[PDB]
Structures are given as structure tokens and as C-alpha cells.
Design an enzyme around this catalytic site. Sequence first.
Site, PDB file in Angstrom:
ATOM      1  N   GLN A 174      -2.394  -5.452   6.230  1.00 43.97           N
ATOM      2  CA  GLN A 174      -3.195  -5.606   5.021  1.00 43.97           C
ATOM      3  C   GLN A 174      -2.556  -4.867   3.852  1.00 43.97           C
ATOM      4  OE1 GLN A 174      -6.075  -7.563   4.878  1.00 43.97           O
ATOM      5  NE2 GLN A 174      -6.112  -7.178   2.668  1.00 43.97           N
ATOM      6  N   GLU A 223      -8.376   7.236  11.713  1.00 40.89           N
ATOM      7  CA  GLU A 223      -7.234   7.316  10.807  1.00 40.89           C
ATOM      8  C   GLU A 223      -6.225   8.421  11.143  1.00 40.89           C
ATOM      9  OE1 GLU A 223      -8.765   7.630   6.868  1.00 40.89           O
ATOM     10  OE2 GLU A 223      -9.378   5.529   6.735  1.00 40.89           O
ATOM     11  N   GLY A 235      -4.913  -0.509  11.654  1.00 39.76           N
ATOM     12  CA  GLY A 235      -4.869  -1.358  12.823  1.00 39.76           C
ATOM     13  C   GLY A 235      -3.492  -1.928  13.071  1.00 39.76           C
ATOM     14  N   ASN A 274      -2.366  -1.731  -6.097  1.00 42.16           N
ATOM     15  CA  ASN A 274      -1.103  -2.289  -5.630  1.00 42.16           C
ATOM     16  C   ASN A 274      -0.145  -2.552  -6.785  1.00 42.16           C
ATOM     17  OD1 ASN A 274      -1.892  -2.300  -2.887  1.00 42.16           O
ATOM     18  ND2 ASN A 274      -2.931  -4.267  -3.151  1.00 42.16           N
ATOM     19  N   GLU A 292      24.589   4.963   1.064  1.00 39.53           N
ATOM     20  CA  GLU A 292      24.894   6.030   0.115  1.00 39.53           C
ATOM     21  C   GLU A 292      23.629   6.727  -0.362  1.00 39.53           C
ATOM     22  OE1 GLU A 292      27.133   4.282  -2.999  1.00 39.53           O
ATOM     23  OE2 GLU A 292      29.007   4.195  -1.856  1.00 39.53           O
ATOM     24  N   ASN A 300      -2.751   6.865  -0.641  1.00 38.29           N
ATOM     25  CA  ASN A 300      -3.880   6.475  -1.481  1.00 38.29           C
ATOM     26  C   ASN A 300      -4.719   7.656  -1.951  1.00 38.29           C
ATOM     27  OD1 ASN A 300      -3.437   3.650  -1.435  1.00 38.29           O
ATOM     28  ND2 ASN A 300      -4.439   3.493   0.561  1.00 38.29           N
TER      29      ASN A 300
HETATM   30  N1  LIG Z   1      -3.219   1.126  -1.247  1.00 37.14           N
HETATM   31  C1  LIG Z   1      -3.498   0.151  -0.388  1.00 37.14           C
HETATM   32  N2  LIG Z   1      -3.860   0.465   0.902  1.00 37.14           N
HETATM   33  C2  LIG Z   1      -4.148  -0.520   1.785  1.00 37.14           C
HETATM   34  C3  LIG Z   1      -4.081  -1.850   1.411  1.00 37.14           C
HETATM   35  N3  LIG Z   1      -4.413  -2.601   2.481  1.00 37.14           N
HETATM   36  C4  LIG Z   1      -4.684  -1.779   3.519  1.00 37.14           C
HETATM   37  N4  LIG Z   1      -4.535  -0.487   3.094  1.00 37.14           N
HETATM   38  C5  LIG Z   1      -4.710   0.738   3.891  1.00 37.14           C
HETATM   39  O1  LIG Z   1      -4.850   0.399   5.250  1.00 37.14           O
HETATM   40  C6  LIG Z   1      -5.823   1.195   5.885  1.00 37.14           C
HETATM   41  C7  LIG Z   1      -6.659   0.309   6.799  1.00 37.14           C
HETATM   42  O2  LIG Z   1      -5.887  -0.162   7.882  1.00 37.14           O
HETATM   43  P1  LIG Z   1      -5.067  -1.540   7.775  1.00 37.14           P
HETATM   44  O3  LIG Z   1      -3.580  -1.312   7.709  1.00 37.14           O
HETATM   45  O4  LIG Z   1      -5.546  -2.248   6.537  1.00 37.14           O
HETATM   46  O5  LIG Z   1      -5.474  -2.380   9.080  1.00 37.14           O
HETATM   47  P2  LIG Z   1      -5.308  -3.977   9.066  1.00 37.14           P
HETATM   48  O6  LIG Z   1      -3.912  -4.364   8.658  1.00 37.14           O
HETATM   49  O7  LIG Z   1      -6.323  -4.591   8.135  1.00 37.14           O
HETATM   50  O8  LIG Z   1      -5.603  -4.420  10.581  1.00 37.14           O
HETATM   51  P3  LIG Z   1      -7.106  -4.320  11.146  1.00 37.14           P
HETATM   52  O9  LIG Z   1      -7.657  -2.933  10.920  1.00 37.14           O
HETATM   53  O10 LIG Z   1      -7.132  -4.643  12.621  1.00 37.14           O
HETATM   54  O11 LIG Z   1      -7.951  -5.319  10.397  1.00 37.14           O
HETATM   55  C8  LIG Z   1      -6.658   1.838   4.790  1.00 37.14           C
HETATM   56  O12 LIG Z   1      -6.643   3.240   4.934  1.00 37.14           O
HETATM   57  C9  LIG Z   1      -5.990   1.450   3.486  1.00 37.14           C
HETATM   58  O13 LIG Z   1      -5.688   2.582   2.708  1.00 37.14           O
HETATM   59  C10 LIG Z   1      -3.715  -2.177   0.114  1.00 37.14           C
HETATM   60  O14 LIG Z   1      -3.654  -3.354  -0.230  1.00 37.14           O
HETATM   61  N5  LIG Z   1      -3.426  -1.169  -0.784  1.00 37.14           N
HETATM   62 MG   LIG Z   2      -7.252  -6.147   8.831  1.00 38.34          MG
END
Ligand SMILES: Nc1nc2c(ncn2[C@@H]2O[C@H](COP(=O)(O)OP(=O)(O)OP(=O)(O)O)[C@@H](O)[C@H]2O)c(=O)[nH]1
Ligand SMILES: [Mg+2]
EC number: 3.6.5.-
Lengths: 425, 336, 439
Positions: free
Chosen positions: C11, C183, C144, C228, C254, C206
Site C-alpha cells: 500500500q 507495528e 502487512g 505521498n 559510487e 510518517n
Molecule cells: N506515508 C504513507 N504510508 C503508507 C502508505 N500506504 C501504507 N502506508 C503505511 O503502511 C502501514 C500499514 O501497513 P501496509 O504496508 O499498508 O499493509 P498493506 O500493504 O496494506 O497490507 P495489509 O495490511 O495486509 O492490507 C501504515 O503504518 C502506513 O504508514 C502511503 O500511501 N503513504
Molecule cells: Mg492492505
Amino acid sequence: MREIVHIQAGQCGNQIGAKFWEVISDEHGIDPTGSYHGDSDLQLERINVYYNEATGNKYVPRAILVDLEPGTMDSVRSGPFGQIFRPDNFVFGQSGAGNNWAKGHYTEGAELVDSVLDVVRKESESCDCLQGFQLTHSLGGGTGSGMGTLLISKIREEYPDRIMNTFSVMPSPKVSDTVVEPYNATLSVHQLVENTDETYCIDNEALYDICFRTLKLTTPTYGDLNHLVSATMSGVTTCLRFPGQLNADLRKLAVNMVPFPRLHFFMPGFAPLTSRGSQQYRALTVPELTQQMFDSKNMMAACDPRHGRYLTVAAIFRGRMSMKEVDEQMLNVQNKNSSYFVEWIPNNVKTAVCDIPPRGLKMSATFIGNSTAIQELFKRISEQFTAMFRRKAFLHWYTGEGMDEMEFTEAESNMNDLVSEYQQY
Amino acid sequence: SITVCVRKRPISRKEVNRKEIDVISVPRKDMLIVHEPRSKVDLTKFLENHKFRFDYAFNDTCDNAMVYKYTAKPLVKTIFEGGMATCFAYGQTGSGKTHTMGGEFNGKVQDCKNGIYAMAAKDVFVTLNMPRYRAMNLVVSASFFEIYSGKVFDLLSDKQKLRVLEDGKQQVQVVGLTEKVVDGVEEVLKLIQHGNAARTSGQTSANSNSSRSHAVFQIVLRPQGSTKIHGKFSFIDLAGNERGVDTSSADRQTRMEGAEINKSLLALKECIRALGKQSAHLPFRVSKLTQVLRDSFIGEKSKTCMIAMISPGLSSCEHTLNTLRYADRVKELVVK
Amino acid sequence: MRECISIHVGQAGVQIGNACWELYCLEHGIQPDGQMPSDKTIGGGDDSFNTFFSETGAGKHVPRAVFVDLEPTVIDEVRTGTYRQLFHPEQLITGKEDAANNYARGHYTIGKEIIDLVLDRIRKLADQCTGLQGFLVFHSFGGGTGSGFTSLLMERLSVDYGKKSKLEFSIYPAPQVSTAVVEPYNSILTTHTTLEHSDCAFMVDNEAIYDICRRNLDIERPTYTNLNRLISQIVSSITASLRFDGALNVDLTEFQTNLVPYPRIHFPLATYAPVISAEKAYHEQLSVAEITNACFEPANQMVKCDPRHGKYMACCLLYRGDVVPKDVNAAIATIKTKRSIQFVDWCPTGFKVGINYQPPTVVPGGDLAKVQRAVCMLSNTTAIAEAWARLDHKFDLMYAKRAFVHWYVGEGMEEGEFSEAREDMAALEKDYEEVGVDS
Ligand SMILES: Nc1nc2c(ncn2[C@@H]2O[C@H](COP(=O)(O)OP(=O)(O)OP(=O)(O)O)[C@@H](O)[C@H]2O)c(=O)[nH]1
Ligand SMILES: [Mg+2]
Ligand SMILES: Nc1ncnc2c1ncn2[C@@H]1O[C@H](COP(=O)(O)OP(=O)(O)NP(=O)(O)O)[C@@H](O)[C@H]1O
Ligand SMILES: Nc1nc2c(ncn2[C@@H]2O[C@H](COP(=O)(O)OP(=O)(O)O)[C@@H](O)[C@H]2O)c(=O)[nH]1
Ligand SMILES: [Mg+2]
């Protein structure tokens, strides 16, 4: 992909499953004849969650609705909530067990599960990803606690990879039928706790104490209390078809709400607390209902949140409101009260804002908490059970029905272990 | 009052083909040293030594009779005093657990003449024939469990699914298990040979008879004409945690039992440390494997003997320090 | 030859990629179809085009990436929106199930049937990439499938390729955006497996990105369409340094040469110079010497830490837009005279000059500045040892009484792999004290 097969049983299961549908068909705005008439695409992309597909904006809302006695089956088919669903899911029985947990589990209730499990085997192959099983029942009745607890085991041994939640209804001394049921209670909790993941603790001891004092409904019916519980059950499942910053799917809700290896009984809170259509209420302001979520009275479980140290405090907000004031008013609690929420999780979930308002409320809220205040709904059942049991009173209603005398002792000792498990302070 | 022993197993033939380095040394009677290769921040590799002291430590040349003589052989003069006694087999998967308890792995068969089940069931009868203890007129009966997918099965009867209930005196009773009455030592070998042939086990090339369940063998010591229980010797063969590189061909069936083996041992790992500190609610009812093992820890007449099994090589140095640290924690326990 | 393939999963990997490939194709001037204008844009001129892109047989340009995500809802934004014809469906891999805030699910049991297809299809990119320069993966710590696929992904490339480096530009969530309670768990389980494979990691945090958008933009809404924007400008610094022929080329090996003193620690900082949001008209365009005088003093809100009490190891700047090189070296003498810039006892060397040509291009609709002065230094500090002391303190106290442990074990994790990951990070926290020694 994200499909849900629903199931319910019992009188309390069927007197809320009608109340469950009427709330969600007006928050999503769904026509009760089978069609849909709405405007937003928030309420239109997520139509495959509970519901099937057919042409002409119609479908069949799948939910297995079952009880042995036909008086309950003929009472949830009358109104516009009657012709909404599939007539081939009419699954009933021959002789209703008269509030006997034994006939609903071993002798008679273990007969027509094959007419129930065959429905579930066909609502599973048609979907592609099944992301849960939901259940609404009473914890101290007949086939609501007999068949509804048995159908967990028939599916958990066949679909073990699916997170299962149950909308539990604890009985109460004040509102009571078949007056003595600590026998029906702890036999229904013991096979629940060993076989479930999430458990929403709703009791009629707190749904009658509020109406006696706050709403001033001194002598209500079940349907007056079915209105209260059907407002939270839409406040819970608003994180399923209304996405937000907290994408809070049931499996993600399972991981984010269960700290200890055993499940725990959730204690949901509520919005400003009135009945249907009652005037004399202020505008639903955001900083006011912070006190209405952490109130010692606004609880859907009779407990003591001033002593129960919080573990998970995930409260879902609904309605177009300011995102800044939500983040600030929560910080007037943990930064002032270190005993209410305590040190277990850094950065615990405290908000999830939805924009779509419920039908009748604008800028409402939904508190879902879990803490050690749920000791008192384990001690009040067990003290009313140990008086039933140490004289072996009313024992003969189960022993002649294919039971065991010493299965009481485990289900007694399983509940006492929960209370000593909650003094982890 | 728990005795802890450890047994390094030798290196197999296939591990020589992959050039495996042995890191576990047992120099003395009751010591062990783990040689851990570590590198510093500047890629300068060094070596750590993790000493351990146990009640008794086994080499890699020790046979199952010597492992028997120091673990379950002292616990037979306890069952004839009224007590009860158990023994574990706790370690990584593939670490020789069912070779010690079950018997010597003779390829396609199970040579049950070795193992701790047979050597103690023989030694009950020799003890029962002494004129000091023949006067009591006891009856030896044997039962045999299986814990698969969190539920208790039975192996004397074929597939009787079993319940776990409780007496009013806080005593766990599996009901209704099969409890055959044993005549002699030629009878109890017929149970174990028929028992291991029905135990649920996977079929692969690396471990063609890997354990998939927590087998429990009980020998119940009963007075004649009283139907009480005077003594029990409950063997426990575990299944062992497996989470290193187990990614061979695991379908939805293989990790279904796979994540349930690991779930049952975390419940066992917690009850050790909860008994380590005091007054906490001992989480015995988390997994049913811990509910069976309740009388081993807090028994007022219970004398257990955990045999910590150790894989010797370099690639299993991570699981080794995990496994040895719990057995040291098991040794430092004073119940009452 | 000089081509490279980036990977965009999670995500926080596609929402970044929706703000990067729009930003990449705006420098070359590329249509949402992908056709080329009449700015002598028939074949590659004096500027190298195929650093991130590829010229197909149909005359147009094709970008090259890896789009893998478990949720099909995110790729449906890409397969319908602006750039729905630049990306071939072979580089559009969608899963079915979800990782659901679980490292154990996203690692292997959903990676059982995707990485057999991903490694099949990056092998398809072998004939379309004669020379490889490396990899740049985008994912998230502490989540995730961002933490799940990443520890699976590095294991299956180092066996196939091995020699090729990879930088991860990773994100762990904030106290303001706290989407899960595990987390600290999912973050430390992917600085465990990746620590033997990662070469430079940028902690895009973040917890300090949102503090910039609170002060410089006065927008208290942590939305993924404005947060973003600030992240993708930092990625655009390294982009044109390998795309356009700048004044001083900074190669990938480098750049790693000066930021990686020991391969064990290898955690530099993304200290981008923060700018002000010009909404209608700027009051004063700042010069080159005015940025670096007060750039790293508010660039400490990139990883929320205190570099002014630790010790530096190195520094490497990277300029965008038009910067005269003789104007650069006047402001560096003042900050060298100060005692705030504290290096180790074994390397007092200053920095490295990197100058590109083009200004950072601006998509309209954003809440950022339209300037031509852009400074992006990327330095490594020993002050972030106490940055990892926060997460270990957030890892110790969810673990002293074994809370939430059964969810990982319930999907296939042993209890030792926690203490294996903790002991592999208690050394790494002490590695920075081991480096920062006055001897
Ligand atoms: N800054 C920023 N952080 C993001 C973004 N998308 C996800 N995150 C970070 O990702 C964390 C949530 O876990 P994800 O990596 O999104 O998990 P996922 O890829 O959605 O996979 P699942 O949890 O199974 O749905 C949060 O703490 C967010 O800070 C984004 O577009 N911008
Ligand atoms: Mg997700
Ligand atoms: N002390 C020993 N000497 C020689 N061979 C041994 C010894 N211990 C184990 N083995 C051999 O090691 C192999 C695997 O042993 P095994 O007992 O299955 O380990 P395990 O931990 O029980 N695997 P599992 O059954 O899943 O728990 C067999 O071929 C045994 O014969
Ligand atoms: N709150 C509430 N409780 C109910 C309702 N209907 C039944 N109950 C409870 O359920 C119990 C009766 O169980 P019941 O479903 O009638 O048993 P069964 O019909 O034989 O399966 C009573 O003790 C009630 O407290 C309802 O509509 N609302
Ligand atoms: Mg074995």
C-alpha cells in the site's frame, strides 16, 4: 474475494436478524422488496460482501436462518423483511426443544444440521474468498444455544482457516424466560470460547438498566431492547463496506483486538443514547461524545470501566466531521488517566472515521472496547451457577437426555480460570 | 524437583554430503558447550562459547539403554510408592525425539525393543516380581493416546475421538480412553508395535516417519478389586517445533497441522515461565497438550524427567540455543 | 547497459508509485497514452531516456517496474486511471487473499503462489534488459504485505542474481497514523531478514513527514494524496541523477561507496531540504547558499531524531535545477567553522557535490512549491542508535508478557524467531556505539 456467509439461530437470533437488516438497509438505503435505490458509489461497489448477484438491481441476501419451532420461522417472514431473501433457505424443524440445551445439541438438535450444513456447502463454493462466519444467538436458551453452538464445531472442523465472530447475548435475572439458566449459560460459553475468535458481550442486565434510568422505559419488550442492539451491530459492520483510514476487515479486526491467546468478551459503547425518533437532544458534537464513550454507564455490557484497565480501545466514528478534533479529544484521556488505559500497546487504535451517517443520526459514533471489566459478567454468572450446582439442583433435566454429570465441572472451572486470568495487572 | 537431561544426537549421512559443521561439544559428565560463529561489525569473524550445566548430559555415542538408565529407570521405584511420574521429549523436529522414546528407526520398521516405552514397561514387571512389592497385589494396565489437530485421539482402539473433562477434585481425565489389562512384557510389546503403526505421520524423503502428533503412553498401576489408581507412568513424545526451513511442498493440509504443532508448544513454553515467577494464573487450558501435562508440574507426588533433544549441526545452532534455554529454565523450578 | 528495474509492492509502494511514475513521465514530457511530442522526441537525443523506461517496437516508450499487491483494489486504480496503457499486464500481478497485518501470512503461505510467478516474469525482463544496474524496492515496515513480501523478495533475487545491489526506501507508520497494533512486530521482522541483504535503507517515517505538512503547509489532514507528494520529491532527486547527464554523475556503487562505511549498519538518512508551500506567488526565491545554511536544521524532521548530539560519518549532497558550482563552496566554510557538524575521529572529510540540470517538475493540484532550487543531501549518522531504541522499547513491552504472540505462531512462526530477531537488533543498536568510539 471478500465474501461473508452469515448464520443465526434461536428466538433472540431471529428477533435481531430482522432488526439487523432493517438498519443496514436504510444506512445503505436498500429497498426491502429485493431492489436497491441509492445515490452514492460508497454504497454500491461493496455489494458482494453479504449479498449475491442477479440482474435488475436484485439479489438474494444470504444468511442461514434456522430454528426448530415453526412459530419463529413464521414471524420473520411477514413484513417487508420477509420476502427480501431466498425461500430455499427456509430451514426449520419438527419439534422445538422447550429451552433445553440438551435436545438442541445431542438428541434432536444434532439431526437437522445436515440440512443446515448442506446450505453452507453451497454458499461457500459460489463465493471465492470467505472472510468470516457471523453468528447472533442467546447464550442461555434452547436451539439458540444448542444448535447455534454445535454448528460452530461442524464448520470449524471443515473451514478452520476462517475467522469466526459471534454476537453473544448473555441472559439476565430481570428479563427472563425459563427462569433458571446458569445451566444453559456456561454450557454455551464453554463450547464457544474454545471455538471462536471474536465475541461481542451483550447482556440484558445492562440493556434494562439503561432503560430503567436513562431512557425511562421502565417496562419495555424485547423489541425495545432489540432496537438498542441493532444500532450497535450496524456500528460494528460499518468497517466492512464503508472503507476509511482504518481499513478494518474482520481478520484485521481479529489481530488488532485480541492480545492474549484466548478470546475475550468485547464491551461496546455507544453514541448519544436515545430511542427511535425521540426529540430533545443537542447537536451531535464531537467533543461531547468522548465522555459518552468512556462513561461508567454508557456500556453495552454491565461492567465497571473505571476499574477495568483497557487493552484495545478501537472506536469507529461515523459521519462527516472534523478530523482534527477527533485526534485532540482522545488525548484528554490517556494523558490524564493512566489507570483506565494502561501500558500494553504503543499507539493503540483509537479512531476510524466514516462519512456516511446512520439512518436517523448525523455525526454519530461507535465505541468498541475490551478490558478487565468483564470479570463481573463472569462472577455474576458463576455465583448464580455455584448455588445451582453445589446442591446438584435441577440436575435431572439433562442427565436423562444423553449428557454427562462431570461436563458441568469443566465448564464451571473454565469460567473460574478466566477471572484469575484477568488479574494480570 | 524436576530432573533435566540433554542428548546430542549424531550427524546423519546426508548432512555429511552437505558438509555440515558440528558445533555441540559434551566434554564432561554434565556439561555442554555451544560453539557459535559470530562476526563483528568489520567482518572479523569470532566464536562464542555458551556453557551449560545439567543434571546429566548425553554424548552422541550413547545408546537408548544408557539414556534410559539415567532418566526413566529411577522413576520406577517411585510409581510403586503411590506417586506418579512422567518424561518429556522436547526439542526441534528431526532432532531424534521419537528415536529415543519410540524406538530405533530401522528404516521401514520400528524396532520397539529399544525406546523408553518398552524398557520401562519391562522394568515395572521386574520390580513387580520382587517379594517386597509382590505383597501389594497390583494390576498393571496400559493406555496410549494421540494428540492430533489439538484434539485427543486413541491408538489402541482405531479412531475413537476423545474428550478432555475434569473431576471435581481438579483432576484432568481423558474419557473414555481404552485401558487394556497387561499380562506380561510380551503383551505390552504388542501394544507398542500396533500403536506406532497407526500413529499419524507424514511421508517424505528427509524424514519418512516424522512425528505429526503428541503421543502419550500411560501405564496405570491399579490395586486389584478397588478401581482406584495407585500409580501412573505417563510417557510423552512431543512433535517438535519446525519453523526453520520447512517450505518443501507444504500445501494447505501440511501447514494446517503445521501451525498447530507450533501453537501447542508456545502454550507449553508459557506454562514453564509462568511457573518460574509466582502467583500468576498458570495458562494450562490454552492447548490441550498443556492440560494433560498439568499433573507433571504442580503434582504433589510428581517426579518428571525432561530429555532435551539437540540437533548437532551449524544450521540448527539457532534452534539449539532456543531449546537449551528452556531446559535450563525447566531445571530452575521450585514448585512447592 | 545502464538499465535498472524497480519494484513497487504494498500500500506504501503503489501509492508512492502513483506519485512517482507520474513524476518521471513529466520530465520527459510523456502523454497519458505514452506517445512522444515534437520536441525533437524521436529517439534518444543528448539525454538518456531508458534509465527507468524502455523504447518498444511501436515507437513509444514503456516504463519498467514490478507491480505486485495482494488486494486487487489498488491495481484497479492503476488498470483504469491515468496510465492504464503504459504498463503491460505481465507487470501487473494481483493476489487474492490479504496479508491482514500479519508478517507470517505475507511471507510464505501467500508467497507460495506469487513468487513462482514473479520470478518467472522478472526472468522475462532478462532479454528486455541487456545490462542491469540494480533494484529499488518500495515497501513498508511494520505492516502487512509490505513487510511480508519484502523478506521473501530479497531471498529469491540474491540466489538468481546476487551481484546486484538494492536500496529500500521503506516506511514505518506513525503514532498519528496507527493502522495496526503489531507495528513494532512486523517492522523488526523485516529489518532482520533484509539486514543481510539491504545496502542502503531510507527510513521514510510518517512520524516526521506529517510534522512537515503541519508546519510548512498547515494541513493537519494526514492524507495519502498529499503525504505521498512530499515523499516522491525525495525519490525524484536520485531519479534524474541516473537519467539526465548532470554536471557530476553519481553512480549507484559510487553513492554506496561514501554512505556505507560498514556493511552491517548501512542506514543513512533521507534529510531532504524542506521547502515552503507557494500557493499563489512566492515572496522570495532562495538561492543555493541560503538552503544549506539552514537545510539540515529542519531536515531533522525526516527521521525524528537529534543529529546534533550524535556523530556524523559522511554526507553526500545532490542538486537539482540550475546551480552554479562556484556559488556552492562559499556557504560550506561557515558550517565547517561551526562545531555542530561533528564527525567521527577517523574521518573529518566534508561532503560530495552532485549537480543535475533539470528542476524538480511539478504536477498541478499539489500544495508544494514551483521552484528551481533543490538541495537533497543523504547522510548517515550515529545519532540514530537511539532511534532504534524507541522501537526496541516498543518491542520489549509487547513481549515481556507475550502479548499478541499467538497470531504469528497460529500462522507458522516459532517463539525463537522473536528472540532471534531481537538479539540481531540488540547487536545492531550496539553497533553504532561500537562505531562511534573516540579511539
Ligand atoms: N506515508 C504513507 N504510508 C503508507 C502508505 N500506504 C501504507 N502506508 C503505511 O503502511 C502501514 C500499514 O501497513 P501496509 O504496508 O499498508 O499493509 P498493506 O500493504 O496494506 O497490507 P495489509 O495490511 O495486509 O492490507 C501504515 O503504518 C502506513 O504508514 C502511503 O500511501 N503513504
Ligand atoms: Mg492492505
Ligand atoms: N542417537 C541417535 N543415533 C543414531 N541415529 C539417531 C539418533 N537419534 C536419532 N537418530 C536418527 O535420526 C533420524 C530422525 O530421528 P527422529 O527421531 O525422527 O527425529 P525427530 O525429532 O523425532 N523427528 P520427529 O519424529 O518429527 O519429531 C532417524 O533416522 C533416527 O534413526
Ligand atoms: N435481548 C433479547 N433477548 C432475547 C430475545 N429473545 C430471546 N431472548 C433471550 O433468550 C432466552 C430464550 O432463548 P430462546 O431463543 O427462546 O430458546 P429457544 O427458542 O428454545 O432456542 C431468554 O432468556 C431471553 O432472555 C430478544 O429479542 N431480545
Ligand atoms: Mg518423533
